[PDB]
Coordinates of C-alpha atoms in Angstrom, one line a residue:
Chain A
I73 CA 26.0 -26.7 -20.2
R74 CA 27.8 -24.5 -20.8
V75 CA 26.5 -21.5 -21.2
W76 CA 24.1 -22.7 -19.1
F77 CA 27.1 -22.8 -16.1
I78 CA 28.8 -19.5 -16.5
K79 CA 24.6 -17.9 -16.2
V80 CA 23.8 -20.1 -13.9
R81 CA 27.1 -19.0 -11.6
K82 CA 27.2 -15.4 -12.6
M83 CA 23.3 -14.8 -11.5
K84 CA 24.9 -16.9 -8.2
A85 CA 27.9 -14.0 -8.3
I86 CA 25.1 -11.2 -8.2
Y87 CA 22.3 -12.5 -5.5
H88 CA 25.4 -12.7 -3.1
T89 CA 26.5 -9.7 -4.0
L90 CA 22.6 -8.2 -3.2
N91 CA 23.4 -10.0 -0.3
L92 CA 25.9 -7.8 1.2
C93 CA 23.7 -4.7 1.2
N94 CA 21.3 -2.8 3.7
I95 CA 17.8 -3.1 3.7
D96 CA 15.8 -0.3 4.9
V97 CA 13.7 -0.5 7.6
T98 CA 10.8 1.0 5.2
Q99 CA 12.3 2.5 2.1
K100 CA 11.9 0.4 -1.1
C101 CA 15.8 1.1 -1.9
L102 CA 19.0 0.1 -0.7
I103 CA 21.6 2.8 0.4
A104 CA 25.5 1.7 0.1
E105 CA 28.1 2.5 1.7
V106 CA 31.1 1.6 -0.8
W107 CA 33.6 2.5 -2.5
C108 CA 34.3 3.4 -6.2
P109 CA 37.3 4.7 -8.4
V110 CA 37.6 8.1 -9.5
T111 CA 39.6 8.8 -12.8
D112 CA 36.8 6.0 -14.6
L113 CA 33.6 7.9 -13.0
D114 CA 32.1 8.1 -16.2
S115 CA 32.2 5.4 -17.3
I116 CA 30.8 4.1 -14.2
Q117 CA 27.6 5.9 -14.7
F118 CA 27.9 4.8 -18.4
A119 CA 27.5 1.3 -16.6
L120 CA 24.8 3.4 -14.9
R121 CA 23.0 4.3 -17.6
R122 CA 23.1 1.0 -19.5
Chain B
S18 CA 19.3 11.3 3.6
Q19 CA 19.3 10.3 7.2
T20 CA 17.0 13.4 7.6
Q21 CA 14.3 12.5 4.7
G22 CA 14.0 8.5 5.5
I23 CA 12.5 9.8 9.3
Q24 CA 10.6 12.6 7.2
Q25 CA 9.0 10.4 4.3
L26 CA 8.2 7.9 7.4
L27 CA 6.8 9.5 9.5
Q28 CA 4.0 10.8 6.9
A29 CA 3.3 7.6 5.4
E30 CA 3.0 5.9 9.2
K31 CA 0.6 8.8 10.7
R32 CA -1.2 8.3 6.8
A33 CA -2.0 4.4 6.5
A34 CA -2.8 4.0 10.3
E35 CA -5.1 6.8 10.7
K36 CA -7.4 5.4 7.1
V37 CA -7.0 2.1 8.9
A38 CA -8.6 3.4 12.4
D39 CA -10.6 5.6 9.8
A40 CA -12.1 2.7 7.8
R41 CA -13.1 0.7 10.6
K42 CA -14.5 3.8 12.6
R43 CA -16.2 4.8 9.6
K44 CA -18.2 1.1 9.6
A45 CA -18.7 1.6 13.5
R46 CA -20.9 4.7 12.7
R47 CA -22.3 3.6 9.6
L48 CA -24.0 0.0 11.4
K49 CA -26.4 2.3 13.8
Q50 CA -27.0 4.7 10.8
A51 CA -28.3 3.0 7.9
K52 CA -30.0 0.5 11.4
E53 CA -31.7 4.3 12.1
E54 CA -32.9 5.8 8.3
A55 CA -33.8 2.4 7.8
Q56 CA -36.5 2.5 10.1
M57 CA -37.3 5.8 9.6
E58 CA -37.9 4.9 6.3
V59 CA -40.4 1.5 6.8
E60 CA -42.2 3.7 9.3
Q61 CA -43.1 6.6 6.6
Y62 CA -43.8 3.6 4.3
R63 CA -46.4 2.2 6.5
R64 CA -48.4 4.4 6.8
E65 CA -48.2 5.1 3.1
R66 CA -50.0 1.7 2.9
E67 CA -51.9 2.7 6.0
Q68 CA -53.4 5.8 3.3
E69 CA -53.6 3.8 0.4
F70 CA -54.7 1.0 2.3
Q71 CA -57.8 3.6 3.1
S72 CA -58.2 4.3 -0.5
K73 CA -58.8 0.5 -0.8
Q74 CA -62.0 0.5 1.6

């Protein structure tokens, strides 16, 4: 039950994050206007590679 | 990036809309085109069977 909980709740958070987005009128991509630290950007793009 | 969204959007919109209209009118013309071609081919076959009937005579 506990791992079921952790999976379900992190899934909830993921979907909430998707809810905070911008759906284009036709384009299937989402355009964000967000923040980002500068010093760790290499690890951020590494996570994008992940 | 803001400029691009309207370029590609306009391209896709025009393409899809004119394709739908093109298919509609293509069927609309094919209606009578098939009708008249079939009529002419039938009449030719009629004369052919007249000639066959002359041979049978």
